[PDB]
Amino acid sequence: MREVISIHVGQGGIQVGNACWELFCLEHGIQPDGQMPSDDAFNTFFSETGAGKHVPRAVFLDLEPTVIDEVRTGTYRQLFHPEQLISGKEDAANNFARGHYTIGKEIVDLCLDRIRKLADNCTGLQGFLVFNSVGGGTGSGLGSLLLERLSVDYGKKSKLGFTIYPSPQVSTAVVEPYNSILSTHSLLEHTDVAVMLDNEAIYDICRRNLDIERPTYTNLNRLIAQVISSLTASLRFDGALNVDITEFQTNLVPYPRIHFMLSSYAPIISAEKAYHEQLSVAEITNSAFEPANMMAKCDPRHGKYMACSMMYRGDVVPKDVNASIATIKTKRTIQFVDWCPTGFKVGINYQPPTVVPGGDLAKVMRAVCMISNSTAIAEVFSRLDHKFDLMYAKRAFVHWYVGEGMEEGEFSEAREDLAALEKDYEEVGIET
Amino acid sequence: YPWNNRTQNTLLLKDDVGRSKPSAYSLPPVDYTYGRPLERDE
Amino acid sequence: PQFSNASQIEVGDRSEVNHRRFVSQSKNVYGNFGKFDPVSNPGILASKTKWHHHLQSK
Amino acid sequence: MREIVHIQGGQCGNQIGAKFWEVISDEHGIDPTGTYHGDSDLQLERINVYYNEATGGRYVPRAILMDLEPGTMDSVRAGPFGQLFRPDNFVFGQTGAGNNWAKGHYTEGAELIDSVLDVVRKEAEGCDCLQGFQITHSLGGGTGSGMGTLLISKVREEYPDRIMETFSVVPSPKVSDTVVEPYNATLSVHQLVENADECMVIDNEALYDICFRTLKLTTPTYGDLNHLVSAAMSGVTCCLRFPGQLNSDLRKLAVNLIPFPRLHFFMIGFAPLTSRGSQQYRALTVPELTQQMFDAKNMMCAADPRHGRYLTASALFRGRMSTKEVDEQMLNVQNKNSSYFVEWIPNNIKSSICDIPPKGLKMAVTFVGNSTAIQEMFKRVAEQFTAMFRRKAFLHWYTGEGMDEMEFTEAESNMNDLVSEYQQYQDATA
Amino acid sequence: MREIVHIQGGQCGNQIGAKFWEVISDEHGIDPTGTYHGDSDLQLERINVYYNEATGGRYVPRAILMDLEPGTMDSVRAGPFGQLFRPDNFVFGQTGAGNNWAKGHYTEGAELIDSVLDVVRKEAEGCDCLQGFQITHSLGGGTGSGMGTLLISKVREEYPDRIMETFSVVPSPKVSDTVVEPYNATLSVHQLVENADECMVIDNEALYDICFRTLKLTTPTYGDLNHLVSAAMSGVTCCLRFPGQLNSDLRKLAVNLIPFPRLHFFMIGFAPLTSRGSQQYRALTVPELTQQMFDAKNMMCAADPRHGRYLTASALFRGRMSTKEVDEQMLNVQNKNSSYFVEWIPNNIKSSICDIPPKGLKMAVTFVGNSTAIQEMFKRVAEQFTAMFRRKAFLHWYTGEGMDEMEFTEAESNMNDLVSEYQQYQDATA
Amino acid sequence: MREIVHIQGGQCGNQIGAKFWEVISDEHGIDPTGTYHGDSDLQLERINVYYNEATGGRYVPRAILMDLEPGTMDSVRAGPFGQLFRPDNFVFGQTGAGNNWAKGHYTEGAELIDSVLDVVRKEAEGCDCLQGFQITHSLGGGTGSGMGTLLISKVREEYPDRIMETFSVVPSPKVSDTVVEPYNATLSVHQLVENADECMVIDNEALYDICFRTLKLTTPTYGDLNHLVSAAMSGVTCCLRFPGQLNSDLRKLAVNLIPFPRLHFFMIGFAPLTSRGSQQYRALTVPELTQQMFDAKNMMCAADPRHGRYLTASALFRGRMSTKEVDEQMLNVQNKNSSYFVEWIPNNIKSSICDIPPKGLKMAVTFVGNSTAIQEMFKRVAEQFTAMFRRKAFLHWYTGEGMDEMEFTEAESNMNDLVSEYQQYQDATA
Amino acid sequence: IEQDYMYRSQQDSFKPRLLPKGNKASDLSYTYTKQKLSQIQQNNNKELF
């Protein structure tokens, strides 16, 4: 009766989305061809064809056929409806202007046509999920367009955006600061919640916990899919304390402007042959709060916490969480803002996390997923502002954007929107 | 044996012409009724 | 003298057979699901995972 | 889709093109009779980028062979793999150009150019969604340096939006073939700077140095230099023709490599290159690949990259590898040689990965670098050109065919302005 | 008690046999007059494997000496330890082979083998329970390659269950002294693979290689080279003659080294080997022995084993030590060099221990390895054969005794198939 | 047991190393025949650090000798203690470097180092647990500076975690004995800063000055100077071999003495040094020892430390004493000379005590200091470099065999940057 | 071209037949073993004349 629709745009969104749908079918027993071998939890992410197979509630968007036909020729060709794999003709080529004012308008009409065709079939929509890598043209340009259009088409409907912000020092492009600044203004007021998912932190977790010296994009997407699976596990599985999507953004958002999140997951256990350990609730919670364990390159000890949402799945007893939470508060390195005396919300689900056969993670009876709001998140905006400062000062690469539908103005208020946003975090965190 | 437009590998190798597009995944054999059935109340 | 261009720089060493030359990472890593008897012995799972990862890498 | 047509001009262009088409056919499993002989199904996945379908299943390239002398076409056709090309695309004159830029750009070009425009526009209307144009030529000759740049200018005129890149073999001073090399080279540079979207310069001296040092072969021929050029040039469209982790077509490269519209001259290099008597040991990993990539002697230009500062760089990785190592190696290279990188362009290296390695190799890397070192090769040509213009000798033939010294005067001034503004950004500080 | 008989042919075979019997006699304390001189009773416990019993308490070897020219047998009699051999066992021809495979295999070999086959048949019956045969001959000579391979054919016919081992010396292209060696080498190789259970390749080039660099003796002679082979020859059958912590005979090695019956060509090496002025400086330990055992330059074949993959390997340790030094080191060497061992046969190495070291040594190791890198010496030999055969050079001698060119054609195909079969198994994955 | 291997190259390394092994053998009670004849049981507890035991009970040093000519290797073999070195550890060419950096680093060094790298690799893995490397060579010469620095680079990429020490004889203009010193002095310094963890520079003029004034020897020789250097070498690793109160190994020295990665150049000294005719007329006490070891004229470098400020110093006391005096004297000298120690680091002197002094002595001290006064050596060398590089004199030899003036500019530029940053902290305040 | 592709397609579909069964002396020993082991019983079967 409850349904959620997922939207994938850009190569970054497509690849991370491929891992998620691999994970979800394993949880619900769906074969890669979609046919059940040998209930009704699958209704959240799947729609019955009438007799037999199931169809995911997703649509794929990109301006290059290279990724889309790979899905259409891979092992998951049997699963998707043929028209939700929207394919373009020419790429934006890391050009925000092309993906926003030049070639994005010939495909956005087709998407919204398919968007409505999935919403009317369902009845109890909770929110939308959109995946994209902000450091690209079509990834950010189309994402900004979709959010703006969906804002007036639906209005009060919840939307979740799991953006992948550029890393502090490593990157694959050279003009990615330009796209990130422009898109951030668009999504500052068009999405209900967003999370920080930069690449360096995921590299650090893989190198440290998994002890893998050969990490690639396949491993990163698998970790992200685990956060997604735990995040929506309360919607399709019976739990001691059920918490819904609308239960999230009414509790983690003090003011409408401040709705940027960061994630952490624990435990991360390699696939070795040791006896391992029981991994009690008290110790898995401690690892979730480790500054180095956060899935974003943000130091929580550099700021103050505002709110925290923690999800436990396994056989966790509410008393153990309550004892563990009390101990965390007493620790001096973790502090909260004065005007927020209580800042913890907990959800418990009975279904244990699943393991992908052939994957890197192992089987564990306890796991925790964390989403928190902290004053320290102001540091990432400052560094991209400085990076974009040295860029726009001598007006480099600008003429490419100007000649493709952009004028000189938008770089101006994009500066001030972040400057206003940065000042907002500074004034919220000050003592009363 | 995937020579040009001869045997099923993918739509790119198909590039069918003339009347329609060839069968792709498996399809039901001949005359399966498509869609959710109805008209039941017990 | 040999006519035309007659190039012999031979950029590839050759004589090496690569049966998995055209197996993409995006294709192979996400869809093996091979063997993995649902046994509850951690050692069996670890040995199978090590062998599977060796086969994937090689 | 997003296809690219090929037009090769001059003797140098045809020599490049023959080996390039042989290399592409070998990569895609095509015999010299146009019959498919591939083993994997990814070989026909994007064959339409360069090839077309003929009756019976024969594949034909979209190459256009054009020149002023029939001696090149009847040799390239008699050579191997010459049956692929359609004779309709074989267009040539009968009087030649005599390596005279004025002649091949003014006198006989005006009437021969109609046929080549007709055939290229026929090819462009035949292709579904055009992506760009590629042209191979040299600036040391007359027919190439003149006719090719005239064609480039007007095809840009009817296609102002589509990208267009060309490969140029600029003449070198230590090994000089023609006495009038500065003149036509300067003219071609002036006519090409405002027309070509991307330009790649190749020095024949650098090819000789590479083949002598790392190949350790005592007797090089024009086939081996063409082979190096063809490999480096076919490495560019690897992610356009095959799936990869981070696909980056020609348009993606253009945005990330050119900071200012008048700065689009690049040097390229290829790796790995092992000796012929190489022992069978180990395997190529990332650190040695990137070390040989950033090695200065590996560059295909006489300009020394250590003489200037890199504006930006691009690497095209071939093979099956992870992504963390390439990024950390690029960061390591930047941190080690920050003195060679201008400081107002943070993280000025782009990385791309293609999952299909070249046949017979485990790993390969293609480098495209926009560095401030090209000012030397402009400066040395300019010094020769001014000395050979003050003499006013060999000038009467150029001036007696419709032009005069005004074009030379405005060309040298414009090229000097290019060098001045190019050094301006090198000396600029953050 | 599972004794073996010795057969040696040709000039090279006689010299290998002459020096080999000296080493065995010294090992078991037998003087040149055939009388026991030893100290311990262990030297007489298993004396029956090599020496028969005669009157007066003297022993005579069960070795058959054959040649097509009696000058070799006159020389072997006048050398040291020349009185041990029974005069009846010498069977010789009065014409000679003249470095011709055809003459020694069709005309002179056929007419003479009746006598020698009677002698070896008589020797085999005398023993209570035969263990096998061992052969020492050169594949480049006339009588050794020609008649030697025909006797193997006849012996295999009448004694099927018994095992046959051959220490064969093939000529290398570097040190070459016979123009017609490619013909008689390849012809024997085709015959050898048909019947011989085990073949061990020896190259004069490798023996020279060891002497100049390892032992550092300025002017080696043929006696020095014969000494190295004799040391390895006695080592392989050591545990059959002495007790030990782990037993292994010739049959056991054959089982654990031959996955497929067509793949029975091994390489051998002996350790330790030290110069005269360096024995005071090296500490003899198992890690030192194992390190030298897998050294590529230590092999007695021109084939480099790092160019292929070890299908199987075996080690026979001689001396007193604990099993931990043995077991741990073989495990360690397999882990550190996992790229040089084929994957589909895990734990492809065998270890044996015998507690009787040689005289003057406290530890010694004999190594027998089956590798696919041995195919390259066959390719080099076949390369020289096809170069000479297309012009039919030196062919009228070979056709003069009835042998026709179809056998020459048959030799090429079978040799190429053997080479291809090695290549197939090297390039195979699970 | 955290043993260290020794590599000595050039003429200086061979002479210094030969004298070094004489002192250590005397300290450990080992005769020139290699048989132990020591006195106390303490001399065998850690003998594995510097020696390897061979079968038979003789100890052989683990040292590798390097040269491009046999001129100096034959003399050291024929000299005293020349039978200790294993003959397999002697590697040499037959041409020589001729005081040319590129010959020993590009043409002859590259071809020869393949053999020696095998010797070092075998030596390193043979022992249980490495502790590091120590190098003795010269920077003003051809084979020592050229091949020597190449091996530092080669071993660094293979053992990135192990420590590495150098005892470098940098040239001083007062003792002018080579006309090409400034060229190959800068090149070696440039390569030495990215790989070596600890560098200890030595000057002949400083060594000559000590002999004339302190020892009051009317006429010294290289034998005397080589002994003083060898004395400092043994004192550094004193706590690594004998029991003490505050043990300090090589790594503990680097941690306390290196504040920044590029500041690892040190100046050393030894005490007590006393003339033969005035030894019995003065007392041996800690106040006397500490007075001489801070004397500006006692160190092995011509630079005056009173022209700069110390960053960190270390003193390694030996013998029987009381820790109260050691701690009090260090504090006393740090307070009365507060102008010579940089303020923003408190207590920048480390002390260590070892109970066993050198034979025949009661107490001894080795002083290792890190001061900004070492910029004078690099400042003065750079001045001579640019004075000679300005006219491009003595340049064609380098550029004629694969060397280019580019990295001459790079080497001079980096060293000049090192000078600027090294004296920057002299003026820096908290 | 059609006939060329017919020939190549029909010839390319046959390859995975290895079954290593080289038997030159091994077959002789194998036959000897069968002969002795089977004929000992037949020798202890004949009726006297």
Ligand SMILES: Nc1nc2c(ncn2[C@@H]2O[C@H](COP(=O)(O)OP(=O)(O)OP(=O)(O)O)[C@@H](O)[C@H]2O)c(=O)[nH]1
């Ligand atoms: N975690 C993760 N991030 C990816 C992956 N692929 C791409 N990215 C991110 O995407 C960013 C750059 O965007 P692109 O790869 O160009 O994708 P895009 O934003 O859709 O732009 P286009 O290439 O034009 O489609 C990089 O900084 C990466 O962080 C992936 O497989 N996993």
Ligand SMILES: Nc1nc2c(ncn2[C@@H]2O[C@H](COP(=O)(O)OP(=O)(O)O)[C@@H](O)[C@H]2O)c(=O)[nH]1
């Ligand atoms: N690298 C390379 N250079 C070539 C080749 N053919 C000719 N050249 C160079 O081109 C120069 C002459 O150019 P030219 O033939 O006059 O150009 P054209 O007038 O357009 O035909 C000579 O200096 C050659 O070194 C080739 O196949 N490869």
Ligand SMILES: Nc1nc2c(ncn2[C@@H]2O[C@H](COP(=O)(O)OP(=O)(O)O)[C@@H](O)[C@H]2O)c(=O)[nH]1
């Ligand atoms: N290793 C070794 N090789 C030998 C010896 N005597 C001869 N040879 C080699 O055998 C080759 C000649 O073989 P040949 O005497 O004609 O063989 P035959 O005709 O069978 O007697 C020469 O090239 C020698 O190198 C020996 O005592 N030891």
Ligand SMILES: Nc1nc2c(ncn2[C@@H]2O[C@H](COP(=O)(O)OP(=O)(O)O)[C@@H](O)[C@H]2O)c(=O)[nH]1
């Ligand atoms: N202290 C000392 N200095 C030496 C000794 N031998 C040579 N030198 C110095 O080394 C310098 C010459 O270096 P050289 O041997 O030519 O270097 P190489 O050619 O690389 O081996 C001279 O200036 C000498 O002062 C020695 O035994 N002791």
Ligand SMILES: [Mg+2]
């Ligand atoms: Mg893309």
